[PDB]
Design an enzyme around this catalytic site. Structure first.
Site, PDB file in Angstrom:
ATOM      1  N   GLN A  22      14.096   3.513   5.642  1.00 29.67           N
ATOM      2  CA  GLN A  22      13.503   2.954   7.032  1.00 29.67           C
ATOM      3  C   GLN A  22      13.408   3.829   8.292  1.00 29.67           C
ATOM      4  O   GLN A  22      14.380   4.090   8.517  1.00 29.67           O
ATOM      5  CB  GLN A  22      13.560   1.515   7.581  1.00 29.67           C
ATOM      6  CG  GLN A  22      13.004   0.756   8.818  1.00 29.67           C
ATOM      7  CD  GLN A  22      11.823   0.441   8.416  1.00 29.67           C
ATOM      8  OE1 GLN A  22      11.642  -0.179   7.816  1.00 29.67           O
ATOM      9  NE2 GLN A  22      11.288   0.900   9.529  1.00 29.67           N
ATOM     10  N   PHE A  23      12.465   3.669   8.826  1.00 36.13           N
ATOM     11  CA  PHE A  23      12.869   5.077  10.037  1.00 36.13           C
ATOM     12  C   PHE A  23      13.206   3.861  11.026  1.00 36.13           C
ATOM     13  O   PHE A  23      12.859   2.976  11.461  1.00 36.13           O
ATOM     14  CB  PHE A  23      11.517   5.159  10.390  1.00 36.13           C
ATOM     15  CG  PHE A  23      11.270   7.026  11.116  1.00 36.13           C
ATOM     16  CD1 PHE A  23      12.309   7.025  11.617  1.00 36.13           C
ATOM     17  CD2 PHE A  23      10.676   6.548  12.986  1.00 36.13           C
ATOM     18  CE1 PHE A  23      12.223   8.396  13.016  1.00 36.13           C
ATOM     19  CE2 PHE A  23      10.035   6.330  14.074  1.00 36.13           C
ATOM     20  CZ  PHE A  23      11.139   8.463  13.835  1.00 36.13           C
ATOM     21  N   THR A  47       5.736   5.145   9.638  1.00 37.97           N
ATOM     22  CA  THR A  47       6.607   4.913   9.139  1.00 37.97           C
ATOM     23  C   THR A  47       6.896   5.161   7.598  1.00 37.97           C
ATOM     24  O   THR A  47       5.725   4.418   6.671  1.00 37.97           O
ATOM     25  CB  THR A  47       7.927   3.590   8.853  1.00 37.97           C
ATOM     26  OG1 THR A  47       8.433   3.242  10.344  1.00 37.97           O
ATOM     27  CG2 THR A  47       8.778   3.442   7.618  1.00 37.97           C
ATOM     28  N   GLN A  48       7.429   6.212   6.623  1.00 41.90           N
ATOM     29  CA  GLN A  48       7.017   6.630   5.769  1.00 41.90           C
ATOM     30  C   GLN A  48       8.288   7.256   5.267  1.00 41.90           C
ATOM     31  O   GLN A  48       9.530   7.404   6.036  1.00 41.90           O
ATOM     32  CB  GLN A  48       6.197   7.876   5.265  1.00 41.90           C
ATOM     33  CG  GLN A  48       5.206   8.323   6.412  1.00 41.90           C
ATOM     34  CD  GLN A  48       5.740   9.223   8.397  1.00 41.90           C
ATOM     35  OE1 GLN A  48       7.100   9.099   8.228  1.00 41.90           O
ATOM     36  NE2 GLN A  48       5.218  10.255   8.561  1.00 41.90           N
ATOM     37  N   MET A  99       6.111   5.741  16.277  1.00 42.43           N
ATOM     38  CA  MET A  99       6.627   4.924  14.891  1.00 42.43           C
ATOM     39  C   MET A  99       5.744   5.440  13.187  1.00 42.43           C
ATOM     40  O   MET A  99       5.785   5.173  12.387  1.00 42.43           O
ATOM     41  CB  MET A  99       6.410   2.957  15.080  1.00 42.43           C
ATOM     42  CG  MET A  99       7.636   2.633  15.382  1.00 42.43           C
ATOM     43  SD  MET A  99       9.613   3.079  15.722  1.00 42.43           S
ATOM     44  CE  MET A  99       9.182   2.259  14.268  1.00 42.43           C
TER      45      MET A  99
END
Ligand SMILES: [Cl-]
Ligand SMILES: [Mg+2]
Lengths: 231, 243, 222, 240, 244, 235, 241, 250, 111
Positions: I1-2, C1-2, C107
């Site tokens: 957040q992804f 995640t970024q 992810m």
């Protein structure tokens, strides 16, 4: 002699005896023929039985809709190498939406066999393979040796007494390459080729195995009464 | 005795006999050559036609690494393919980290260290190939030849395989008669002649000629195969010289 | 995640009778700061494919290197690398789509929206979309980001369904694309006046136009 | 890791390391098993070459695997401990997961499986041990007696012997054991077991061990004097 | 490859013997004799150092007798360096047990553990076995005073009196002749020294060639004391028993 | 010494060829396939009269529709049987169906050449795998330590195999009944066995579509032995 | 007799594979020499290009390990380059970890330790090379440290390696017996190179052209190799007196 | 690749001999003589600096090495094997002791750690034993001064005085006649120099002899002042001049 | 957040007849209030007379269909070109889905 204990040892003349002994297993195997035109490619294989109660050992394996091979030598080794080809054909289709080129399939088989000839603990593969296929550059025929050497050919034969079929194909070269758009005549030429390698026995209905792939023809294997037409 | 039964064992001479036996496999292979010209390199190889059933021009021997390096080898063909596969990995990682395509001397050592590593242990066999390779980088043209021991040097001309002595003599004449240098197009012609002349050691079967080249002016420093009219022109030039 | 840092805005595209057109502006934004003004976001692959990329620029540069490596790899031991065994738009897309979905599944996505435009071996138009989630779809017109909301409505007036494609010339299609780019410049706060445009035609091949500008602008009425 | 194939086939189809493991069993002290109608008796030879031995603490030849199953052996003593430990762990694991103690056949099958594994695994040699495994299945009154050997084959026996001079005591058992009428009592079974060892043992003193296993986890080892009374009664009937 | 140079340390002979175990036992037969004798009121450990020198610092020297914990000690016969590897492992096992159960490890459990480690080297790993035989002298509240021995095979047995190392055949016969069950520690001390004096390959048995230890409940009341004898104390007990 | 995966000058694997010699020393096992079912029979060969012969287990169930008989180093068969059972059950779990007899056999044969310096040597046992599926009906396979498997109408393995196979050559035809096959296995076992054949030193079994795999009771086999004796005395 | 094939002790307590690796050292038939000045360390080595097809600029046995350290190798080129790459990696890692340039003697010790391992571990063979490391150390000044296949190393006032090392060694010994100092008392490196070449000519009894030699020079903060034209200037000065 | 020698290269022969250890001891026998003598207030260790060439700077080759501030070591046999053992011994003194107890190990325990390393090269897969015998001299608060010998097998013994290598048999006899339990450190040094002269052929001076002592604390070699409890190292290597001064009173 | 998931809309319908079966679905693909495509096929012929649709998050839907099609291919390779029956396909799809029990394919599948 003193240099044939393992695959990791060169002889004083630069030979690899374990690889040469693996090559010898192919010569003991039953004869199989490969040949192609510009539209189709054909495999013909003489299947071998243990005795009169037994089945005839299958010789031809499908790898994809557009590719497959025939074997001569250790059958379990052919199963390992054909499984690897199935995976590589499958990887190409899933990742790149692309049918694996027959020439690239040969390069992959060469490299897989080579690793077993340069390392300790392992052994060379004890089987020879004839790969046919139809891809974006037309019909193809390959010959695989467990030394790693893969060769593209118009026609060939491997196994016991394969020299008779190979000479016949060398004579007929100019005729069978021109058999375009006629699957039955190309198979006839292959059945006539493999007949030059028979002694004492002849081609029966459970003896003969034929495969074909072409322009609008998925790789299909013919056995049983499906080859009676060609006997 | 017994010193020659295992790789990486020093004989009382200080020799590695297993590496020397790998050289015998190289000497048994077909003739391959390399010629360094004014702004590039030319590679050529003898392909023995074992049978009429071999499809002409299909069983390609010369291999490209990255887009600027050509490789050709004599001996066990699968061993040569294994070495080129490693070379391609080495070139990719170099370009990944440093952006610029791998320089030829840098690439030469990558192959050299890898081949040398296969003389350090008894659990591996030495490479049964001598590899002639090179191309164009920022400092110009480079030609190398690499032996089973891992030994390599830079060359003006290089030859290996069964007809190496014949080829070497021909290469030495070119070096003497052209101190100023040879053009890329001249080198292609000369490469065709030398392979035809070296084919006397393999005179039983007929052969197929295969040539490639990298040149700053002729190919923009990229490796390309010599095809069609330019190949036929070189074959004609070669056939004229043997008669 | 970024999170995306340096970003590129809309990529727009459509099919016409003989091929495809794709366009994207030359800006690399840093939030509301219009930081970099000479960023090429259309990347050609061979002479039959153009990949347009929006979103994170650092990930775009990574994808650009993957495509460059793909061309090198395809040429290895391939005598027909410039003929029958050249890279197809469909091969290039499927590879990218595989990568995008794999990365989201770990992810750790490549924070982009991508449109692959090209012409296949048989002359068929290729136009397909993929994004950071691995979601893929095709349509006679495709656009990313703001382009999806503003360009598509205009481009769909030209080609509304499959049967409109053979009726659409390259002049009409390019005109529609150029007008859409002007509308996006009026209304997207992260757009620039300078853009690139690429035409892939089955007859005339790949035409790549750089340093194009939005012109014929109305303001007066203010 | 060390991966060397020690157990391999020879041209005549023999695995010599497994066969040489049997030779270690041949050297080991004699063990014998006899099942009666309602009991199983395990007899073991103690070589009297070692006196000044402390018999309280010296490892006994018969080992409890669970409260209802016992194991005796012939061959390498150190090897047998590894098999005994594994068997004891498996016995508790079986109780924990199945909520029932092992059958004698199951425990035998496990130990035999471990022995086989050591004949085609790299870097290991076979166990130089043959075992006699005896007991009663949970809630069952039928006597059980099994034998295993280095190769990993196992089978059930009405009576069996292993170790040195086991050829002689098997000879005795084959002519003295009737299948239609097995030793009906504990006394008769112990007597026949002591008799079989007396064909081979030497002095009937501290050279013979006897362990009796009855149904429902009833296992007891006979003392020197109790065995000595059997030894006395046997020879007094023989003087005739 | 490497197979060529592999001695294969863990194989049976055609007779069903372990080559390396047998050859390790041959090595041990040349080591200095160690003797253990168990009495009703304690245990004695006596051992002969191998042909020493006058310049050897005896009072700080230890090659035969080692402490495993406060209740258990060992006498060594064979390669001293091999023995110290095993000794340290045994010391750790004893402490592991004490931490887990809050009770001192029973003697046999320690002996079985070390013996299992020896066994492993004979069945797997392709390494040479430890060239060591131990005599274990120990006390616990279950069996009281106990003597054990273990050898490179990993086999162990219990004893009233036992010898390892050189001349065990002669030593064991002498012990078997004079040992009695109601014997006391002071009597056992004399038997051990007399046996070494007769079996030794040296000309005479002196204090500088011996290591000596006792495990006694001669510790004030309900407890056990280990006593590793000092050079002067070995000299005194040699005079007391009338050997020098 | 020499590698475990070494080829001979004739192109055969030494270890595989040597394991075949161990199988020749094994007790005889015979299979006969008919359109009414497949029969499997074995020689028990107890080494002593004190050995309880019903503990000798050389015929084994793999699934309800697949049985198996062994010959050679029978301890080696246990992991092969375990794998076969797991493969049969696993396929049912994945596909809600019975596994094909050939597919099961192929899965077992995949283990065979997994030896080197994986297990340290080939298996020293041969298997007769018999079963039924909807696609190919009643089938009998011979699984070797080479990794090769042949389908057979009838097959004998073990010490009396070449004598038994010659007998099976003459006796088998495509119209055999299950009862005829049972007597035929008993007849040929009796021919090649050292000891005199009875219900305690020989064992029969069969696989039918209706009832699945069944090992025969000693009482059931004893009747078939009596039926055999009378019909041989009938001419 | 497998005690001759791998690095285990013979009954005499010898390691034959190490001894045979020393013999491989002279396979190139090349002699090298190293001497120290006041401010510099000079190393010279014979250069033989026996094939006319070779590119002579690529034929070298002198290596630039770091900015400060140079290395000449006596032995086959594959093993030489193996040692060169490793030395370069070790020198770079040292600077990264410890914040200062790796000293010549410390690198020599490290490479000697690696060599020692090959004499004790069976799976690794010794390298058939002798490595002469040179620098002008910031603490010790001009430095020569030489490593061999046995894992031995030591510092030198001057040293020689090759088939004719003894002749060169005795020649150097005799000079330092006269001067009674541990170095060449000269200001410029140019004259120290001239000394080195002159004494190799005297010891071997052979003349040299510009293409017959290979020269490396270490000064404070850099090591560098001379071109053929730089060597020619050196040879001219030698002949003119 | 991978190290495929996972089996022992040292094994028992039929006679019970461990060949490779015996052969390692033979290599030690060929080595240059080194010795150690323990006095009441110190220990001395000494050896010959057998220079391989006169062009070699033998000061750069240290045969006598500091292991801890209060422990030193000398050897006979294979130099390279010694050098790596010194590296391992220095490190193990920290990792297995100083980083745990905040103090340097006592002589006997450091010796024990070195011995363990040497034992493992005698049993572990694919290695040969170390071809050296070590003499380790040291001091610690509770054990006082001590001197130990460590052999290729991993066996170690404490000595009042001893010698190893070339002329050890003659040297040990020489030491037996001269040693007593009342020697002062200067007396031990004098005896060391006398003993070492017998086994040396050529030059015998401060440049050809390497000699170190374990004696009094050297606050001048500590490198800092201010902490009363820190009083400096007891290991001190004698200079070329210091040796020559004692060779006049010889 | 992804957020690794999305919603592509769509509606599918399966009905089983007496000797036939239909699987239908709309061809519209969406995110939020926008149309991605007016014709994006959602129901697929997977071979062996089996049709399949995995509706919801289209990336997961495409991945599942792709893996099932692949499973049909390998079923033919491994089991002598045997036809994969609908009940066998259904059990196989359960294992494909449950394999990602703790990171699910966000789809509602119908065959
Ligand atoms: Cl280091
Ligand atoms: Mg080595």
């Amino acid at each position: 002699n003193n240099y044939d204990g393992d695959t990791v040892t060169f002889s004083p003349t630069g030979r690899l005896f374990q690889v040469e002994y693996a090559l010898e297993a192919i010569k003991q195997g039953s004869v199989t023929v490969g040949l192609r035109s510009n539209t189709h490619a054909v495999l013909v294989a003489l299947k071998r039985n243990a005795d009169e109660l037994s089945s005839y050992q299958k010789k031809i394996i499908k790898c994809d809709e557009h590719m497959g091979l025939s074997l001569a030598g250790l059958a379990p080794d052919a199963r390992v190498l054909s499984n690897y080809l199935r995976q590589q054909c499958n990887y190409s289709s899933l990742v790149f939406n692309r049918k694996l080129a027959v020439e690239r399939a040969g390069h992959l088989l060469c490299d897989k066999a080579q690793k077993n000839t340069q390392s300790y603990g392992g052994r060379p593969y004890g089987v020879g393979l004839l790969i046919i296929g139809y891809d974006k550059s037309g019909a193809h025929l390959l010959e695989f040796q467990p030394s790693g050497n893969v060769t593209e050919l118009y026609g060939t034969a491997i196994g016991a007494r394969s020299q008779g079929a190979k000479t016949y194909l060398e004579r007929t070269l100019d005729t069978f390459i021109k058999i375009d758009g006629n699957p039955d005549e190309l198979i006839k030429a292959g059945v006539e080729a493999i007949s030059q390698s028979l002694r004492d026995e002849s081609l029966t209905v459970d003896n003969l195995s034929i495969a074909i792939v072409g322009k609008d023809t998925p790789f299909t294997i013919y056995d049983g009464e499906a080859v009676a037409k060609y006997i | 005795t017994g010193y020659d039964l295992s790789n990486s064992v020093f004989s009382p001479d200080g020799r590695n006999f297993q590496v020397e036996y790998a050289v015998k496999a190289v000497e048994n292979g077909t003739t391959s050559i390399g010629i360094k010209c004014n702004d590039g390199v030319v590679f050529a190889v003898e392909k023995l036609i074992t049978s009429k059933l071999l499809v002409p021009q299909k069983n390609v021997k010369i291999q490209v690494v990255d887009r600027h390096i050509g490789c050709v080898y004599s001996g066990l063909i699968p061993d040569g393919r294994h070495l080129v596969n490693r070379g391609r990995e080495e070139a990719a990682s170099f370009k990944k980290l440093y952006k610029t395509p791998i320089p030829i001397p840098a690439f030469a050592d990558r192959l050299g260290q890898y081949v040398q590593a296969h003389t350090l242990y008894n659990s591996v066999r030495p490479f049964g190939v001598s590899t002639i390779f090179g191309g164009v980088d920022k400092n110009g043209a480079h030609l190398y030849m690499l032996e089973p021991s891992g030994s390599y040097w830079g060359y003006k001309g290089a030859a290996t395989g069964k007809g190496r002595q014949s080829a070497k003599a021909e290469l030495e004449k070119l070096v003497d008669h052209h101190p100023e240098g040879l053009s890329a197009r001249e080198a292609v012609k000369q490469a065709a002649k030398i392979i035809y002349l070296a084919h006397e050691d393999n005179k039983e079967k007929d052969f197929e000629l295969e040539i490639s080249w990298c040149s700053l002016s002729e190919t923009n420093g990229l490796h390309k195969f010599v095809k069609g009219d330019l190949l036929q022109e070189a074959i004609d030039f070669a056939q004229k010289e043997i008669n | 995640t970024q999170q995306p840092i340096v970003t590129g805005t809309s990529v727009i595209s459509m099919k016409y009778d003989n091929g495809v057109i794709i366009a994207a502006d030359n800006l690399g934004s840093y939030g509301s700061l219009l930081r970099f003004n000479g960023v090429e976001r259309l990347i050609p692959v061979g002479d039959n494919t153009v990949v347009g990329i929006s979103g994170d620029i650092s990930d775009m540069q990574h994808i650009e290197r993957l495509l460059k490596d793909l061309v090198t790899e395809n040429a290895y031991d391939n005598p027909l690398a410039d003929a029958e065994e050249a890279l197809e738009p469909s091969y290039i897309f499927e590879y990218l789509a595989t990568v995008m979905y794999q990365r989201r599944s770990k992810m750790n996505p490549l924070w982009n929206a991508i449109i692959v435009a090209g012409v296949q071996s048989n002359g068929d138009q290729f136009l397909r979309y993929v994004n950071l989630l691995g979601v893929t779809y095709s349509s006679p017109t495709l656009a990313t980001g703001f382009g999806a909301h503003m360009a598509n409505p205009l481009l769909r007036k030209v080609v509304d369904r499959e049967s409109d494609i053979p009726k659409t010339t390259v002049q009409v299609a390019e005109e529609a694309i150029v007008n859409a780019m002007r509308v996006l410049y009026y209304r997207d706060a992260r757009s620039s006046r300078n853009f690139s445009l690429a035409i892939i035609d089955k007859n005339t091949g790949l035409t790549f136009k750089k340093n194009l500008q939005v012109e014929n602008m109305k303001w007066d009425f203010a | 890791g060390y991966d060397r194939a020690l157990s391999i086939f020879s041209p005549d189809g023999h695995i010599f390391q497994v066969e040489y493991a049997l030779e270690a069993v041949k050297r080991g002290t004699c063990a014998v098993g006899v099942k009666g109608k309602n009991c199983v008796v395990l007899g073991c030879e103690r070589r009297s070459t070692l006196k000044l031995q402390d018999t309280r603490i010296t490892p006994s030849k018969v080992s409890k695997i669970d409260s209802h199953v016992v194991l005796s052996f012939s061959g390498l003593n150190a090897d047998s401990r590894i098999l005994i430990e594994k068997a004891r762990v498996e016995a508790q694991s079986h109780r924990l997961t199945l909520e029932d103690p092992v059958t004698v056949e199951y425990l035998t099958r496990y130990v035999a499986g471990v022995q086989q594994r050591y004949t085609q695994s790299g870097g290991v040699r076979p166990f130089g041990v043959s075992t006699l495994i005896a007991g009663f299945d949970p809630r069952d009154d039928e006597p059980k007696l099994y034998q295993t050997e280095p190769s990993g084959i196992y089978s059930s026996w009405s009576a069996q012997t292993i170790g040195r001079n086991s050829k002689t005591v098997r000879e005795f058992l084959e002519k003295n054991y009737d299948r239609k009428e097995p030793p009906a009592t504990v006394e008769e079974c112990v007597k026949l077991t002591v008799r079989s060892l007396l064909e081979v043992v030497q002095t009937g003193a501290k050279n013979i061990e006897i362990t009796v296993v009855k149904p429902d986890s009833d296992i007891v080892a006979l003392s020197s004097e109790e065995i000595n009374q059997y030894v006395t009664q046997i020879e007094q009937e023989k003087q005739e | 490859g490497s197979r060529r140079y592999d001695s294969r340390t863990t194989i049976f002979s055609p007779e069903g013997r372990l080559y390396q175990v047998e050859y390790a036992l041959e090595s041990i037969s040349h080591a200095g004799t160690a003797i253990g004798i168990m009495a009703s009121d304690g245990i004695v450990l006596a051992a002969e150092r191998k042909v020493t020198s006058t310049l050897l610092e005896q009072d700080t020297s230890t090659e035969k007798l080692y402490k495993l914990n406060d209740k258990i000690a060992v006498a060594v016969a064979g390669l001293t360096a091999d023995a110290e590897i095993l000794i340290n492992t045994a010391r750790i096992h004893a402490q592991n047990y004490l931490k887990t159960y809050n009770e001192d490890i029973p003697v046999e459990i320690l002996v079985r553990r070390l013996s299992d480690i020896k066994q492993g080297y004979t069945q797997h790993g392709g390494l040479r076995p430890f060239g060591v035989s131990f005599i274990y002298a120990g006390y616990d509240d279950r069996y009281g005073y106990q003597l054990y021995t273990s050898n490179p095979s990993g086999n162990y047995t219990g004893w009233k009196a036992i010898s390892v190392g050189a001349n065990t055949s002669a030593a064991q016969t002498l012990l078997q002749m004079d040992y009695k069950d109601d014997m006391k520690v002071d009597d056992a001390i004399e038997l051990a020294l007399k046996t070494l004096s007769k079996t030794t390959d040296s000309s005479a048995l002196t204090y500088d060639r011996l290591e000596f230890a006792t495990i006694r409940k001669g510790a004030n009341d309900g407890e056990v004391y280990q006593k590793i004898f000092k050079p002067q104390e070995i000299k005194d007990i040699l005079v007391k028993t009338g050997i020098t | 010494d020499r590698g475990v995966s070494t080829f001979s000058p004739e192109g055969r694997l030494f270890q595989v060829e040597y394991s075949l010699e161990a199988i020749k020393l094994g007790s005889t096992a015979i299979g006969i396939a008919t359109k009414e079912g497949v029969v499997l029979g074995v020689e028990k060969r107890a080494t002593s009269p004190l050995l309880e012969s019903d503990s000798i287990e050389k015929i084994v169930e793999i699934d309800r529709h697949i049985g198996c008989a062994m010959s050679g180093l029978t301890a080696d068969a246990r992991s092969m049987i375990e794998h076969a059972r797991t493969a049969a059950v696993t396929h049912n779990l994945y596909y809600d169906e019975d596994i094909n007899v050939e597919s099961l056999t192929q899965s077992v044969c995949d283990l065979a050449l997994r030896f080197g310096e994986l297990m340290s040597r080939p298996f020293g046992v041969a298997l007769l795998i018999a079963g039924h599926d909807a696609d190919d009906g009643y089938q009998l396979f011979h699984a070797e330590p080479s990794g090769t498997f042949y389908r057979y109408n009838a097959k004998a393995i073990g010490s009396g195999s070449e004598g038994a196979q010659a007998e099976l050559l003459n006796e088998w035809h495509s119209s055999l009944t299950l009862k005829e096959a049972e007597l035929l296995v008993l007849k040929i076992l009796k021919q090649v066995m050292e000891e005199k054949l009875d219900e305690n030193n020989a064992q029969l079994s069969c696989i039918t579509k209706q009832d699945g795999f069944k090992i025969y009771d000693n009482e059931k086999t004893a009747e078939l032995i009596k039926e055999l004796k009378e019909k041989e005395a009938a001419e | 007799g497998y005690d001759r094939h791998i690095t285990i002790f013979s009954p005499e307590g010898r390691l034959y594979q190490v001894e045979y690796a020393f013999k491989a050292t002279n396979q190139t038939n090349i002699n090298s020499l190293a001497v120290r000045g006041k401010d510099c360390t000079v190393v010279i080595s014979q250069k033989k290009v026996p094939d006319k097809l070779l590119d002579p600029t690529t034929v070298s046995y002198i290596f630039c390990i770091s900015r400060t350290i140079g290395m000449v190798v006596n032995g086959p080129i594959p093993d030489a380059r193996n040692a060169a790459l490793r030395a370069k990696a070790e020198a770079a890692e040292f600077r990264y970890k410890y914040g200062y340039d790796m000293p010549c003697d410390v690198l020599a010790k490290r490479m000697a330790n690696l060599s020692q391992i090959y004499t004790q571990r069976a799976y690794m063979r010794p390298l058939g090379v002798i490595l002469t490391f040179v620098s002008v150390d910031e603490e010790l000044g001009p430095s020569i440290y030489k490593t061999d296949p046995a894992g031995y190393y030591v510092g030198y006032k001057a040293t020689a390696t090759g088939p004719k090392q003894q002749e060169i060694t005795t020649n150097l010994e005799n000079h330092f017996k006269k001067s009674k100092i541990d170095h060449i008392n000269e200001e410029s490196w140019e004259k120290v190179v001239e000394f080195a070449i002159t004494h190799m000519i005297d010891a071997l009894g052979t003349e040299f052209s510009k293409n017959d030699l290979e020269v490396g020079v270490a000064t404070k903060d850099k090591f560098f190799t001379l071109s053929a034209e730089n060597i020619e200037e050196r040879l001219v000065a030698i002949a003119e007196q | 690749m991978t190290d495929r020698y996972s089996f022992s290269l040292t094994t028992f022969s039929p006679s019970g001999k461990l060949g490779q250890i015996d052969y390692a001891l033979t290599a030690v026998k060929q080595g240059v003589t080194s010795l150690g003598i323990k006095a009441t207030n110190g220990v001395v260790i000494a050896t010959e600096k057998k220079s391989s060439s006169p062009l070699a700077m033998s000061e750069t080759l240290s045969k006598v090495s500091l292991l801890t501030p209060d422990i030193g070591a000398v050897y006979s046999g294979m130099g390279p094997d010694y050098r790596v053992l010194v590296d391992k011994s220095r490190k193990v003194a920290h990792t297995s002791y100083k980083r745990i107890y905040g103090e340097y190990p006592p002589t006997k325990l450091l010796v024990s750690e070195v011995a363990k390393i040497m034992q493992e090269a005698t049993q572990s897969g694919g290695v040969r034993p170390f071809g050296v015998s070590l003499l380790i001299a040291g001091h610690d608060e509770f054990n006082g001064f001590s001197l130990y010998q460590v052999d290729p097998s991993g066996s170690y013994f404490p000595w009042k005085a001893t010698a190893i290598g070339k002329g050890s048999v003659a040297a040990k006899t020489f030491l037996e006649k001269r040693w007593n339990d009342e020697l002062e450190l200067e007396d031990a040094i004098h005896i060391a120099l006398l003993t070492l002269k017998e086994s040396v052929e050529g030059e015998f001076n401060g440049d050809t002899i390497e000699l170190a002592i374990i004696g009094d604390e050297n606050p001048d070699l500590l490198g800092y002042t201010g902490i009363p409890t820190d009083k400096g190292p007891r290991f001190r290597k004698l200079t070329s001049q210091e040796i020559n001064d004692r060779l006049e009173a010889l | 957040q992804f957020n690794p998931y999305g919603d592509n809309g769509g509606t599918i319908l399966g009905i089983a007849g007496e000797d036939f079966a239909v699987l239908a679905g709309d061809t519209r693909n969406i995110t939020d209030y926008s149309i991605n495509s007016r014709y994006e096929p959602k129901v697929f012929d997977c071979g062996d007379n089996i049709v399949m649709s995995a509706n919801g998050f289209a990336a997961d839907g495409d991945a599942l269909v792709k893996r099932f099609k692949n499973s049909v291919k390998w079923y033919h390779f491994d089991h002598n070109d045997k036809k994969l029956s609908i009940n066998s396909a259904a059990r196989n799809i359960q294992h494909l889905l449950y394999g990602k029990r703790f990171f699910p394919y966000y789809v509602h599948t119908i065959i």
